[PDB]
Design a protein around this ligand. Structure first.
Ligand SMILES: OC[C@H]1O[C@H](O[C@H]2[C@H](O)[C@@H](O)[C@@H](O)O[C@@H]2CO)[C@H](O)[C@@H](O)[C@@H]1O
Ligand SMILES: [Cl-]
Ligand SMILES: [Zn+2]
Ligand SMILES: [Zn+2]
Length: 431
C-alpha cells in the first residue's frame, strides 16, 4: 500500500468497472486515486498477501469469510457513526459484527434464485422432483432443463439444506464448531438427488459457472441457479427470462446460504481514514451503489434509500423471497474449512469417485477439525506500552509458530519491564 492512494480488491463477477467509476468520482472530489483490481482466488490471496504487507487497502467478499480475516488480525475495526449506521438495515450490520466489533461495511444481500427461460418454460417447476420429467420433455426438443455450477458448494447448498443439512449448530447466539450437520439425513437426501440427476443424465458432473452461464444465455437450457451479479450478462443476451423462488425438495423450501457483500479495511493499510471516506460517503450512497449495480446487479442493497426503490424490480423481490427462506451465512474462522470440505464432497459424489455417504462422512470430520490458532490473543498486543512491541507481537502471533516460539518471540521483542507487571504479558498469561 501507499499513503494517499486506495487499492481495492473485488471478485470478477461483481461490478468492478462500476466500482472504478465511483473511484474516479472520489479522485475528482478529493484528489485521492482509487485502483480497482479483481485478482483470481482473491478470498485465498488476501490472507496470503496480508502476511507479506502486500494487500489492498479495501477487500470485498461475502461476509462469511470476514470473521476468519478478523480473527487473524487482517482487518481494522470500522467506526461508522450512529447517524451512518441508521442508513443501512440493522441485519446487514449484524452480518459484519465479530466478537462485538464491526469489522466491515455491509454492501448488499445476496441469495440464489431459480432463473428460467420464459419461452422454453413458461411455468417453472415448484419442486425439484418434477425436474427429471421436465428434462425428458425438453431433451425431445434438443434442450435441457437445468444447468448450474456443480464445482462451487454455494450453488448446491440450497438443496442440501432443504431437508435438514446445516453447517454449524446454532444454540442461543452461538455456533457449536464440534456439531457439523453435513452428514445428517437431510444432507444426504439432497446430495443423493443431485447425484441421481447426474446418473439419469439430467445433468453432467463437470458443469461449472462458465458452462452453465453459456447454456442459459444462448437458450440451450431452460433453467440455471445463480445470483444477482449474473443478470447483467442475461440482459445483454436475447433470452426472455424470469427470477423466482427455488424449487422445494421433499416439500420443504430450498434454503440458500445468504451472503452479504462486505467491504473490509486492511489492518495494515495506512489509508484507513481515506478508506472510510470512500466507503461511507461515496460507495454507500445512492449514486455509488447505482454505479456498481448498473455494471453487475448487487441484489438487495444495504442502503435503505436505494433498496426501497430497487426492491420494485421483481428479480430483487425474488432474491429477498429466497433469502428469507434460507439463512444468513455464519462469519465464524471455521467457515473456510466448512466450505472446502463440502466442495470436495459434492465434486467427489457428483463424479462417482465417492458415494454420497462416504463423501459427506469425510466432510463432517474435516469441517469439524479443530485448528491450532494463537491469533485468539491478538488483543493483548494492543496493551503494549511501545509501538515497536505492538507490531512485533502482531507478527509473532500471526506467524504459524508454536506456543514456545510465541513466548520466546515476545520475550525477544516485547520485554520492557518484568513480565508480571506488564499489561501485555498479564493479558497473554490469562488468555
Ligand atoms: O462456493 C462456496 C463459496 O460460497 C460463497 O461464494 C459465493 C459468493 O458468496 C458469491 O458472491 C459469488 O461470488 O459466488 C460465490 C460462489 O462461488 C461464499 O461466500 C464463499 O466463501 C464460499 O467459498
Ligand atoms: Cl490475477
Ligand atoms: Zn459466450
Ligand atoms: Zn452453445
Amino acid at each position: 500500500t501507499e499513503e494517499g492512494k486506495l487499492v481495492i480488491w473485488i471478485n470478477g463477477d461483481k461490478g468492478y468497472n462500476g466500482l472504478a467509476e465511483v473511484g474516479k468520482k472520489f479522485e475528482k472530489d478529493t484528489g485521492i486515486k482509487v485502483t480497482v483490481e479483481h485478482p483470481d482466488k482473491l478470498e485465498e490471496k488476501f490472507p496470503q498477501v496480508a502476511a507479506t504487507g502486500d494487500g489492498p487497502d479495501i477487500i470485498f467478499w461475502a461476509h462469511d469469510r470476514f470473521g476468519g480475516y478478523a480473527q487473524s488480525g487482517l482487518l481494522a475495526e470500522i467506526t461508522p457513526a450512529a447517524a451512518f449506521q441508521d442508513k443501512l438495515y440493522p441485519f446487514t450490520w449484524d452480518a459484519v459484527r465479530y466478537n462485538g466489533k464491526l469489522i466491515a461495511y455491509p454492501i448488499a444481500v445476496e441469495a440464489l434464485s431459480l432463473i428460467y427461460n420464459k419461452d422454453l418454460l413458461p411455468n417453472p417447476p415448484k419442486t425439484w422432483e418434477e425436474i427429471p420429467a421436465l428434462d425428458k420433455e425438453l431433451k425431445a426438443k434438443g434442450k435441457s432443463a437445468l444447468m448450474f455450477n456443480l464445482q462451487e458448494p454455494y450453488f448446491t447448498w440450497p438443496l442440501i439444506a432443504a431437508d435438514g443439512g446445516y453447517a454449524f449448530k446454532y444454540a442461543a447466539g452461538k455456533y457449536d464448531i464440534k456439531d457439523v450437520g453435513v452428514d445428517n439425513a437431510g444432507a444426504k437426501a439432497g446430495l443423493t438427488f443431485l447425484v441421481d440427476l447426474i446418473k439419469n443424465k439430467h445433468m453432467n458432473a463437470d458443469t461449472d459457472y462458465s458452462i452453465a452461464e453459456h447454456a442459459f444465455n444462448h437458450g440451450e437450457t431452460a433453467m440455471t441457479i445463480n445470483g444477482p451479479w449474473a443478470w447483467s450478462n442475461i440482459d445483454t443476451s436475447a433470452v426472455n427470462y424470469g427470477v423466482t423462488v427455488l424449487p422445494t425438495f421433499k416439500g420443504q423450501p430450498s434454503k440458500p446460504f445468504v451472503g452479504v457483500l462486505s467491504a473490509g479495511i486492511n489492518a495494515a493499510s495506512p489509508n484507513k481514514e481515506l478508506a472510510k471516506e470512500f466507503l461511507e460517503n461515496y460507495l454507500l450512497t445512492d449514486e455509488g451503489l447505482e454505479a456498481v449495480n448498473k455494471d453487475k446487479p448487487l441484489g438487495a442493497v444495504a442502503l435503505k434509500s436505494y433498496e426501497e426503490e430497487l426492491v420494485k424490480d421483481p428479480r430483487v423481490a425474488a432474491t429477498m423471497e429466497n433469502a428469507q427462506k434460507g439463512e444468513i451465512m455464519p462469519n465464524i474462522p471455521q467457515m473456510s474449512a466448512f466450505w472446502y470440505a463440502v466442495r470436495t464432497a459434492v465434486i467427489n459424489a457428483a463424479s462417482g469417485r465417492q458415494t454420497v455417504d462416504a463423501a459427506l462422512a469425510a466432510a463432517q470430520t474435516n469441517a469439524a477439525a479443530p485448528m491450532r490458532n494463537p491469533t485468539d490473543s491478538l488483543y493483548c498486543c494492543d496493551r503494549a506500552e511501545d509501538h515497536a512491541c505492538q507490531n512485533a507481537c502482531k507478527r509473532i502471533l500471526m506467524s504459524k509458530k508454536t506456543e514456545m516460539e510465541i513466548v520466546d518471540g515476545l520475550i525477544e521483542g516485547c520485554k520492557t519491564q518484568p513480565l508480571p507487571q506488564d499489561p501485555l504479558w498479564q493479558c497473554f498469561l490469562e488468555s
